């Protein structure tokens, strides 16, 4: 069949360590957006917020294009982890002993190389809970995502609005919003700007 | 099927002539492959003769051809060209093309081979 | 012997990344059914339900057929994880730090390619415990299973009735039923419907 | 030396996925016996029993025979995990988040292929603690071992009496016995009987 | 045993003739294999001559055979056929078949080889 | 040492005769190995001639030998036999045995090779 | 493109087990400096201090040099873990069950082989908390970093001043300083001196 | 350089599965000794003792010898885990859920093949805490080390005195000694004696 | 491109003469490569003739050349030299250079090959 | 460098004579290597002639040499010896030694090869 030819052909000359860009002097464009599912817990003795999230990263490969008229029937291909270049996007402020709680899944590609990656996770961020208005409070918590190695001139991260559409209402805390913002910062280690995306969850006490 | 590469322009010419070996391609996306020219003598093995990357400007020639032969490609007509000048008596062998997925032109993992052609000096 | 020839022949041209379907323009059919064994715990301060389960998935390969008259004696072959295509079926609403608690085991195949996969697990789902009728309550908890990458036009999941036949009665909570239902949903990320199977455990307080 | 020739010769034509039996239409014979070392804890709020155990499995390979007169000096060979076929024997009723707490070690073979495998572990079974005679009780706890994939017509498990000879007496609970029994059960998934071995620990309160 | 592939239809014919090389198979399930025809000259190496996938319609011919020869298969009689037309004085070599487990016809990991046959022009 | 395989029974015979090529083995456990007969022509490469698995009944012959030659083994005397009947003028080459650890007779990883023998027709 | 040629050329003759030095009779020079981000917790019943840190080490390879005029566009290359030699720098006094909580990331190299490695981590050190002045105390905690195998005559570690610039102030404890000092000690196991770097966090109670 | 030739040469014909002994009919000699660093905790409700230890085992390979006059500059080579034969020494009486808490590190070999292995770990032993003299007690805890597979006629373990020289005094419990003793025991599984080394920590309450 | 190695100094000389085969390099950093000289006879295969590591002092010669030929390198002019003395009648073959990334001179993974040259005795 | 293996003792002798082929070694620790003798005919490939393990007593000979030739080693003088007796007309070829790190004598991964020698009968 043709699905067995496609997989043998797409990986002829592929180096998982190379940025899949046509002109190697231009930055790739990754699209980032998270999707909340539930506010599992908000600890106050410590300062930690546990949530269920689905990350959404979308880029455009250039070495995984074929012709659906030559390979009839096949219109998408799924690549496991470790065989295709994937962005290294981490959570800067995390309180998990492992520092990374994402559960790796397959990367989905279509006839034009537009790759999609939606890892689920149970993320334990680090927030600041204020109880100076114990009866009523509008707490704001931050989630800061960004690329660790690639940054600036290489991987121009872009933000997409969050998707609160499967949210399951919590008991004590109620959501008020989850705005997002994109920033560019300079660090002491290197001399090239690094972008980042910050999402601000607003939970009001009931 | 229909992944066919057809060569043309062979023949015989005295020392110090000219040739315009050409190779047309069909059946695959010609803009995602880097053609390489190979030459085999009757009593020898395969040898490089030129190579061009898929981007368009990566020409790599051989040491003994560096100054004489010139390689070129045309994506609009799905063709490759190997202009040969100042031919010498030991440039007698079969010339054929070999494609390869996105690559530089230098050693790679070739996929689609071509047909033979005869050039005599 | 013939088992050593069978194992050397069955993996001549096999790509673990390929859907084992004959006509690559048709969807494969997977059969899903869970088997409960015990309700280990039902937390109420948090909202979590811990159970012991055996998943049951059955598909039909097409590249693992042989003739028992040519290979006498051999009537079944067992393949480990990472050498045969296995469906990626996850539990959507999980409260485990790893998000996947299944213990991978072998896949069993017979002379016609009918594969069986029964991973055991101790699953920690997320439920909603209501205590407005503390003396008597009929709590309903949900378990939602589905394919992550493959969905719609590719993997037509089907449901089979649960199997409460080795259940060990609990102390405080008693079972009343575990019905199942199959649904098809549209997500914002893609444009193709995704199926899912939901099992509803009904636990009544004693 | 000869120990370097033996290891290069024994693994010439070996497939770690093959049941090492001479006549592939007959069942292999495995010998199972556990060895207790200490009753580490007996939880009562929950229902769990933590113990320290050494499993003992013994089969007879057929592809690892040599002649000690041709390979002088070498009388035993030790194979790590993943290079020699090992039975997949699990604990059916486990309360550990991983479902398998065994620490894999080497398999020991002698000049006739009689393999020995003694994995140690700290097992957390699931028991039923009755406190209706709180002052005095004779609690019985069960440990059920069996093969997951291989069973019936393939791997005829056999039992050997437990070995309480290094037991370190506990403080509150005192042992009275650890009898064993072998049973043959039919499951709904398949149609071929599966054997199992059950050990009953009897702990009396002090 | 009994995994036997037997070819027939060889012989000698003048330039511009016809031939109906056939190959019967036995001992294995003929519907789970893709036959491929190979040709070897007395002083050369193996070369592709055709190929058909197990499904039934995946014919892949060679560049120097695209327009002349035609490959076909019959699952009911467990046979393969390679109709040869407009033979040239260069098509002189031993032709033999090679099966392979589920495959496309293009390069695979062949399992069962066949016996040689002689065709002269 | 002492892992020695010794051939015998070679010679010359006219077309349509008989032969009883034999091979004795020593130095290794003869009951844990599957002997395979190989034939090499003066101007060709190695080719299968027969094969028997260690169990005792797995005989695999070649396509062009299927009906003429018969292979057998004797564990009591540590010997292998290849009875040859209806010899043709093509069966002229060196025949030698090759053992292999527990195997089927078909392609394996051979360990102990044997010595050559001459058979002419 | 040239990024695919560079990755294929840089790893022609590379042995990840070799010290990347020109004259093998001279010591390599590694540069070490940590960066604090938050004092997550300071336990007192036990003696443990949990912090969020970014290690910073920077050596200079000699086998990863190229010419940016011959490979236009490519000015940096990122190598995953397991393919380029990385120093083995551990925390001598750790209280984590794994003894190493660093999250491995890529190593960044530029046109001259100057490598950078900045692993993040949530480190659990071991401190001595004194409460003889409960209202006011100036507790000092120590973090000792050093190479395990390489030491002396091989890897001349050097220290760089800490970087408290993204510090997020804590609630109860306030920072006063984090000085560093380099020492050279002799151990009983070997006879060659081993260097180490010690950082002293000075937390005052509020 | 020569460090690359040495690494390419030392692993020409090496089988990590073979005992590095010259005459395969004689036992190898391993030297064992632990080094304490701190008594992290002594639980009394349960029976567990947590310590910070450095193991020290030394053997003599015979296949890793070279000539420093032919390979000038190179006087030591470090091999990671999985490429050189290392003794399998475990702690018989462990209370850790994994049964092995050692953190694997490199093996350091010199010009004569004398290897050294010093894995650090946070070991959770199992003790018997007696409180019949609560004001003053001299508790004794045991740590039993030994080889799992290799034992007797193969690996003649030998003991070296412990090294309490970096000990950091604890608060409540004060050390009095850590004697060691070597014993040879017969087990029921096999018929060849197995050696072991037992260290007795003496902790007196303050 | 422009990764070119050009040899020179070939010719013919009677037994017991002298030669100064040289090879210039261009297109790559000459200080990160170890040149190795290879010799191929008309009816034989490739063979070592000498080798020098990138550092500068690692000369490894062959057993049959140990005392006659001497290899040297010049990083300032991007050249390699193979002085040949006391040539014998058996030293007739094509000599060409081969570079390799950081290496010792002994067997390695060569990257850039050179052009042939003819020396006759 | 200086890892040199030098052969000696070649020549010509009538059928049924004697020979004492010897091979001296230098440059490497001779007590950590197992020498193996290889023989190559003018129109054939390499073949085993003998082998001795590093320990001192592991001699493995070939099937066609088992009774005639005898291999030995001397660690004090860094030499190997292959006494040849009852030479026969087909024992004409180049004999050379090959070392290998700690090994048995049977197939290993050889490191240092030697020089050729001529023996004619
Ligand atoms: C494969 O996916 C791409 C990306 O979604 C499709 O191309 C367009 O992508 C843009 C976003 O960059 C969408 O806004 C368009 O709607 C997409 N075109 C569509 C949906 O027709 C592309 O069409 C997909 N399929 C193929 C065969 O290319
Ligand atoms: C192998 O398994 C298949 C699947 O169970 C058997 O084929 C039939 O499968 C259907 C379900 O799709 C069952 O309802 C039938 O009972 C099965 N046939 C039987 C049990 O005879 C198949 O028979 C099994 N064995 C072989 C040799 O094919
Ligand atoms: C190798 O182990 C086997 C198995 O223990 C030994 O063979 C006999 O095995 C039975 C159990 O099936 C024991 O009851 C016998 O005592 C064993 N024979 C003995 C101990 O002599 C075998 O002897 C062992 N060694 C060799 C060289 O075979
Ligand atoms: C690659 O990185 C190195 C190291 O940073 C740069 O070389 C100099 O390195 C020193 C530190 O050892 C700095 O103080 C200098 O500022 C660096 N030179 C600069 C920044 O020009 C080197 O320049 C970097 N880039 C290249 C192409 O070499
Ligand atoms: C390599 O290590 C060995 C082992 O330490 C050194 O050889 C001697 O080993 C014994 C212990 O078995 C020590 O008591 C001696 O002091 C060691 N000799 C010394 C230190 O000179 C050996 O010297 C070390 N180095 C070399 C080059 O062999
Ligand atoms: C890549 O981009 C550069 C500048 O952006 C341009 O000069 C060049 O032509 C582009 N294509 C290449 C380098 O192949
Ligand atoms: C895909 O193949 C068809 C038929 O071979 C061809 O007409 C079409 O142009 C190809 N696609 C593109 C983008 O050229
Ligand atoms: C596969 O299915 C399609 C439509 O369902 C049909 O046209 C085709 O003949 C089938 N077989 C193939 C494509 O081999
Ligand atoms: C299996 O083999 C037997 C004998 O070779 C044959 O009769 C039978 O038809 C084969 N199976 C099928 C499905 O054809
Ligand atoms: C294997 O066992 C079967 C029945 O148990 C018997 O018929 C056969 O002869 C035995 N040996 C084989 C199949 O080689
Ligand atoms: C082992 O070898 C010796 C000598 O080669 C032989 O006498 C003995 O019979 C062999 N073992 C068996 C079981 O035959
Ligand atoms: C390396 O250093 C030594 C002494 O430090 C010196 O003699 C030598 O020339 C240097 N270079 C080498 C060894 O290549
Ligand atoms: C890099 O290449 C350019 C052009 O090939 C050359 O001029 C330059 O000298 C090279 N770099 C170095 C350090 O020599
Ligand atoms: C090895 O030791 C045995 C006895 O200990 C001895 O007989 C033998 O000669 C030694 N050397 C060997 C076996 O090569
Ligand atoms: C090491 O090499 C030197 C010079 O090659 C030599 O003199 C010395 O003897 C060698 N070492 C040993 C132990 O022989
Ligand atoms: C971009 N990262 C964010 C903080 C560290 C920095 C970095 C820079 C270079 C290599 N790794 C990490
Ligand atoms: C919404 N989908 C189903 C769950 C995961 C998600 C998805 C979609 C496409 C590719 N990967 C994941
Ligand atoms: C009921 N069986 C025994 C326990 C697991 C289960 C099973 C059956 C077939 C294949 N895998 C698992
Ligand atoms: C340098 N390290 C510090 C403590 C252990 C010591 C060491 C020495 C040799 C090999 N491994 C570790
Ligand atoms: C020392 N080991 C642990 C206890 C038994 C012994 C052993 C014997 C055989 C195989 N593994 C382990």
Residue numbers in the entry:
A (entry chain A), C (entry chain E), D (entry chain D), G (entry chain B), H (entry chain C): 1 to 206
B (entry chain F), E (entry chain J), F (entry chain I), I (entry chain G), J (entry chain H): 1 to 121
Copy out sentences from the published article reporting this entry, exactly as the authors wrote them:
The human α7 nicotinic receptor is a pentameric channel mediating cellular and neuronal communication. To develop a novel class of α7 ligands, we recently generated two nanobodies named E3 and C4, acting as positive allosteric modulator and silent allosteric ligand, respectively. E3 and C4 bind to a common epitope involving two subunits at the apex of the receptor. In this study, we solved five structures of the α7-nAChR in complex with two nanobodies, unraveling a common epitope at the apex of the receptor, which is formed by the MIR and the N-terminal helices from two adjacent subunits.
To check if the weak TMD resolution is due to our ICD truncation, we solved the structure of α7FLcryo, also with a 50-fold excess of C4 and added 100 µM nicotine to further stabilize the protein conformation (C4-Nic structure). The resulting reconstruction reaches a resolution of 3.6 Å for the ECD/nanobody part but also features a disordered transmembrane domain, indicating that the flexibility of the TMD is a distinctive feature of the α7 nAChR in our preparations. Still, extra density is visible below the TMD/nanodisc area, compatible with the presence of the bundle of MA helices. First, for the C4-Nic structure, Cα Root-mean-square deviations (rmsd) calculations of the α7 ECD show that the C4-Nic structure aligns best with structures obtained in the presence of agonists, with or without PNU. We quantified this by looking at structural hallmarks conserved in the family (loop C capping, cys-loop motion). Measurements of the Loop C capping (10 Å for the Cys189A-Tyr117E distance) and of the cys-loop outward motion (11 Å for the Cys127A-Ile168E distance) clearly show values that are characteristic of active/desensitized rather than resting conformation (Loop C capping around 10 Å vs 17 Å, cys-loop motion around 10 Å vs 8 Å, respectively). In the five orthosteric sites of C4-Nic, we found an additional density in which we could confidently build a nicotine molecule. The pyrrolidine points downward, and its electropositive ammonium lies in a box made up of aromatic residues from loop A (Tyr92), B (Trp148), C (Tyr187, Tyr194) and D (n+1 Trp54). The pyridine points upward and elicits contacts with loop C (disulfide bridge Cys189-Cys190) nand loop E (n+1 Leu118). In conclusion, with five C4 nanobodies bound, the ECD of α7 adopts conformations similar to those observed in the absence of nanobody, namely an apo/Bgt-like conformation in the absence of agonist and an agonist-bound-like conformation in the presence of nicotine.
